Ligand binder design. Structure first.
Ligand code: CL
Ligand code: CL
Ligand code: CL
Ligand code: MG
Ligand code: MG
Ligand code: RB
Ligand code: RB
Ligand code: RB
Ligand code: RB
Length: 136
RNA sequence: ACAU
DNA sequence: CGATGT
């Protein structure tokens, strides 16, 4: 209904899908960029959205912050809830890095706790999430 | 259909 | 127009 302004917003950006993937997290209220991942040569939109949420969880936990996380990705929200990224991307030498990061993010979820609410950013009502890359 |  | 996902 209403935006929770005291939150972290995350989003993926890419060049192609599959293609070069990056992600970032921003303060929803101010747009300040709080973290940005260096581009990964091949990944999917959904793998990047998943990594962005998990990085957000780790970032907030390290800082003892109870803020929620907004994501626009129905898929990634579910994958984090399930602790399992059900990507179709081929596992081969070209995709080794993205898959290593996804495997490591799942591993973190299976070995740590968090209370962070993971909320759907309601793009249809609110416009683009504040972490968006402005590329579409 | 919906979400990217 | 193409892709990734539930
Ligand atoms: Cl990562
Ligand atoms: Cl909340
Ligand atoms: Cl959702
Ligand atoms: Mg997104
Ligand atoms: Mg975006
Ligand atoms: Rb802590
Ligand atoms: Rb975009
Ligand atoms: Rb979107
Ligand atoms: Rb589809």
């Amino acid at each position: 209904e209403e935006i929770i302004w005291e939150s972290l917003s995350v989003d993926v950006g890419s060049q192609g899908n599959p293609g070069i993937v990056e992600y970032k997290g921003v303060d929803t209220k101010t747009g300040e960029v709080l973290f940005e991942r260096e581009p990964i040569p091949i990944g999917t939109n959904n793998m990047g959205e998943f990594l962005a949420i998990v990085h957000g969880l780790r970032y907030l936990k390290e800082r003892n912050s109870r803020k929620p996380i907004y994501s626009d990705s129905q898929t990634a929200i579910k994958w984090v809830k399930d602790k399992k990224a059900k990507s179709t991307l081929v596992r081969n030498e070209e995709t080794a890095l993205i898959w290593k990061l996804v495997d490591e993010a799942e591993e973190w979820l299976n070995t740590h706790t968090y209370e962070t609410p993971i909320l759907k950013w309601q793009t249809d009502k609110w416009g683009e999430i504040k972490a968006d890359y402005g590329r579409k």
